[PDB]
Amino acid sequence: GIIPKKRQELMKWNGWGYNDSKFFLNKKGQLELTGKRYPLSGVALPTFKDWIQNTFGINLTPPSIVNEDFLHELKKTNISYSQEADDRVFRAHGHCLHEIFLLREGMFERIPDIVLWPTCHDDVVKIVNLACKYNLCIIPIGGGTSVSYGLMCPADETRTIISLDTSQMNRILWVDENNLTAHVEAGITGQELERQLKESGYCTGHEPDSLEFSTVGGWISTRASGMKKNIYGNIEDLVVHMKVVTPRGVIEKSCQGPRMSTGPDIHHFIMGSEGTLGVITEATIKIRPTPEYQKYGSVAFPNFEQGVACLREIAKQRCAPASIRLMDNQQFQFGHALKPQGFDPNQLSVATLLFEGDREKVLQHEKQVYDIAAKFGGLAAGEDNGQRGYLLTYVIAYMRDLGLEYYIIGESFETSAPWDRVVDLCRNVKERIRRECKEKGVQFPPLSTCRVTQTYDAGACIYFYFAFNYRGISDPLAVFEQTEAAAREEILANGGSLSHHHGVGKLRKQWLKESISDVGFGMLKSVKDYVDPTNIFGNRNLL
Amino acid sequence: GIIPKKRQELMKWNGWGYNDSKFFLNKKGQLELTGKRYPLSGVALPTFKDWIQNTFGINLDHKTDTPPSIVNEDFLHELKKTNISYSQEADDRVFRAHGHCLHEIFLLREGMFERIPDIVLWPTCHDDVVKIVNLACKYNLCIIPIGGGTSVSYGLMCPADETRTIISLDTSQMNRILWVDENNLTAHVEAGITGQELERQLKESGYCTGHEPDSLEFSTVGGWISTRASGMKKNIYGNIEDLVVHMKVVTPRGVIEKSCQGPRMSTGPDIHHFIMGSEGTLGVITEATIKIRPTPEYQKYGSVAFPNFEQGVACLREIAKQRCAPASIRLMDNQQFQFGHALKPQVSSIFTSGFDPNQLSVATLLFEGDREKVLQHEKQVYDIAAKFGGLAAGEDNGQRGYLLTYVIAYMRDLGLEYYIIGESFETSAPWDRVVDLCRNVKERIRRECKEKGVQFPPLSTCRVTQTYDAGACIYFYFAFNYRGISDPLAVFEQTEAAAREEILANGGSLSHHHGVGKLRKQWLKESISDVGFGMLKSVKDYVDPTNIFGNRNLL
Ligand SMILES: Cc1cc2nc3c(=O)[nH]c(=O)nc-3n(C[C@H](O)[C@H](O)[C@H](O)COP(=O)(O)OP(=O)(O)OC[C@H]3O[C@@H](n4cnc5c(N)ncnc54)[C@H](O)[C@@H]3O)c2cc1C
Ligand SMILES: Cc1cc2nc3c(=O)[nH]c(=O)nc-3n(C[C@H](O)[C@H](O)[C@H](O)COP(=O)(O)OP(=O)(O)OC[C@H]3O[C@@H](n4cnc5c(N)ncnc54)[C@H](O)[C@@H]3O)c2cc1C
Fold this sequence. Notes:
The structure is a homodimer.
Chain A: E1 23-25, E2 31-33, H1 48-56, H2 68-77, E3 80-82, H3 85-90, H4 97-105, E4 114-117, H5 121-133, E5 137-141, E6 161-165, E7 172-176, E8 181-185, H6 190-198, E9 202-203, H7 216-222, H8 229-232, H9 235-238, E10 239-246, E11 249-252, H10 267-270, E12 279-286, E13 288-289, E14 293-301, H11 304-316, E15 323-327, H12 329-337, E16 349-357, H13 359-374, E17 379-380, H14 383-391, H15 396-405, E18 408-418, H16 422-439, E19 447-455, E20 459-469, H17 476-493, H18 512-516, H19 518-531
Parallel strand pairs in A: 4-6, 5-6
Antiparallel strand pairs in A: 1-2, 3-4, 7-8, 8-12, 9-13, 10-11, 10-12, 14-16, 14-17, 15-16, 15-19, 18-20, 19-20
Helix pairs in contact in A: 2-5, 16-17
Family (chain B): Belongs to the FAD-binding oxidoreductase/transferase type 4 family.
Subunit structure (chain B): Homodimer.
Pathway (chain B): Glycerolipid metabolism; ether lipid biosynthesis
């Protein structure tokens, strides 16, 4: 689960995930994931082609500019580095639709000049000192899974850009079994973190969909949320200590107390800072005994609003399972179409459930959730509709690359909102997307779908997928990017936030001042200007 | 539950709480609380005197102007036009010149403060606040906001060499519930509403916050946010940082507010955390939205005795490991067990003084929620406790323990009448440090007091008041008989600062909830790092570049 230095030997240079995993038609004419990595790898999907054809109407480098004296001092440190075109281009992007285009079909305007692979905190201190001495710009990179343009190099940045790659700084340093805390280097991936903890009988439970590649430091930088936050917390509840290298010096608290009142919480000044302040090198995270048992479930509702009302009541009774997601009809069908073999079926909606903990407790909780559900017309729909909509989740981004081969472009986007705004926001956003697409000359009605993906006391996270068959469309990116920007306007007009988890990066910068207020924005600026006065950390995210 | 403008008409000018509530000796010579407000009010406490005689070595027979208001005439003229209520009276200013640290109360009892507010203003809304901070910019004034006046960190004290006119900006008349949103289970409130009045008014609608810090009769929303307050039932309701969904803050730079009411976002560093724990140094928190819950169906008290404190700590740790802490669980050492016992009804004889009765520790429990869930959870928790030698010690004992928390602060004022000085202090620490930290802190206090010439061994006692996944909050009480000692305040303050050294050397935090104020400033940089100190400074310099908010807490 360690990312090798030459990423492209294992990962796709032009898309998501591993080289050995891509959808193909098997010898029975049916979509199938290549390779052996996933529970769905090698599993025929006999209705997936039918669903895709129905849904979309288809048949089926810049030179390296680097100071010689800097390079001389770098050689003395014995830190590994590269000026090769493939290494630099690989770290010049995340996973936004726009970037993945430039990467398949052209070239970016600016890419890092040099890649460095520090293996520890001290190496990071060396590199930030060199950047001060030689006037260099640093863009940190972990998993490279940003969906906010947070890795894109500014077109007019004229300094040498270092891509400071954290993927070789990836060890668990200590596991404290008395306090259930693990102290880890920040380049460790979710997958490798969980694998090594599980050999001791522990987990963190933090499971964002990008966990095979995304890193501890990246989660802290972007305020990451994982599928099971209902039991384990999101990144801000999980982290108890961190250590950060900035050009001003090293930020670290002197104790590992679980909660303190010692002024404004400086951990919150670093969480969500998106690579703009320094490098998070190590963090202490809460750990838990691995649960004894897991069960998936699902519930059908006669429509979406009944489902949303049921999720709301579950959150009011504070008895959410490990994960509870509510899919609208299109998303459900997407799922139903993906099996390996009453209620009006047009508005019929489906919640998927995941329970984990002790066997006897799990089965007791499962009963309670189905009883709350019955009050809203909800009927149990089975583990496999459950089991499968969550085996599904690590594969959806492999589907996006398949669409591009067939002239389909799609992206997801998200928001959080008060409970009382969820139904209208979902309906109005989906309709805004349909309206814009028609107005922009999109021939076929787009895929425009939502799910409720997390529940909170005060409201929910809502996740949208938007995609269309771009047949007969001149400029399919510009249509798509205008339509995304429009949906965000619609989100914010309906009381939703700028982002629940993806973050702001450079994609949503233009709305930030309005979201956090002028003085709010002025405060983020003031911390930046103190900690990094010469803007070494210049990816220009946020501000 | 609204604090009136002239506080001294209802509240003690020289101590904690209500004028109508104090301890006095009965017509039979038994200690008794006056008045009618608490469960213990008008209840004679026949053994309390002995306990005080035994713990402090005293008898209990042996008992024990203002600066001018400096204010610019033009300012005052513009203030008159706003119709904002104000006062230059010495008793209104003196009342707002202090919180509830021992030193301050001692100073109110035996003399005068070096610096007190020049004028007290009572805004009734966010717009009045905006007007007042505009005036302070225009006329170069200093503002110290005050809500309940319950700070225990010197957070209200006026800096002696502050030469500008100081406004005490009192929030107590800004106390409305602006809306209660039953769909989202949130209430948006003005920041001067007290805990007690907020809970009273929500309960009429079927709701509560569940945030119950021991000072809730007088401490306010704005205060809790400023100081990162923690309340008794955080295990169910959350501490202040989990409870706050939105806030509006007036600073000299302008108003800070997010544009939405979403429950969790990722829009950069969370600016609510720049404000929480700012202790009055950045601006005035005027309004805040807070989570609310239906009032619980049922509450159930309980208690459990363990063979010693260590076993009790190991049992709390297992309950935290199983994530099944009740709404409140507190473990008291043997000295607090003995104390609580000395508060009962029974009049003992004057001729009489499997568990060891003086090693035994006791935990008090409270569960609240739906009756069915409560009772299964109680059974779960008692099953765990038995594994550690725990024996159920009765619900009456748990209920009495809970009530007692609101009356302890009146006990402090009683000790002052009899030459006894005391204070509580607190920390948070990892699980693996708790037992050693408790033991070493208590022994440091005994050692310091002996070395400084205190005659009798001091009261030095502790309890575990909150469990977390990664550690616990530990609360200490320290008191001695200072009869015989020259400089009582210097001895106390020196022993207190020594204890804090011991806490920090044993892996405890600088504060779990009371905060930093001006009392703990000298450890702050070491606690949060030099760069983290610097980052706090940069926000303060941006938002308040002329230091209008000048109480000089933190930094
Ligand atoms: C298919 C897919 C599924 C996803 N699902 C989820 C999900 O469930 N939940 C969720 O929250 N997110 C999700 N994301 C978004 C992304 O995975 C998260 O934002 C994640 O935290 C990024 O981590 P990274 O290590 O990949 O960071 P990168 O992409 O490498 O960097 C993100 C930003 O952090 C900065 N940065 C990186 N590491 C450091 C460091 N050590 N110190 C300082 N700055 C740093 C970078 O400069 C950049 O600004 C998903 C993305 C994709 C493409
Ligand atoms: C007997 C006793 C018991 C206590 N128990 C607890 C407890 O269980 N938990 C706990 O956390 N604390 C407790 N405390 C501490 C104290 O009550 C809390 O810190 C409380 O949060 C302060 O509230 P207040 O309204 O009294 O604020 P004040 O003391 O009036 O103000 C505290 C600080 O906040 C600033 N301030 C006040 N209002 C605002 C505003 N609207 N905007 C900006 N700044 C403001 C002040 O300038 C001061 O610096 C206790 C104190 C006492 C004496």
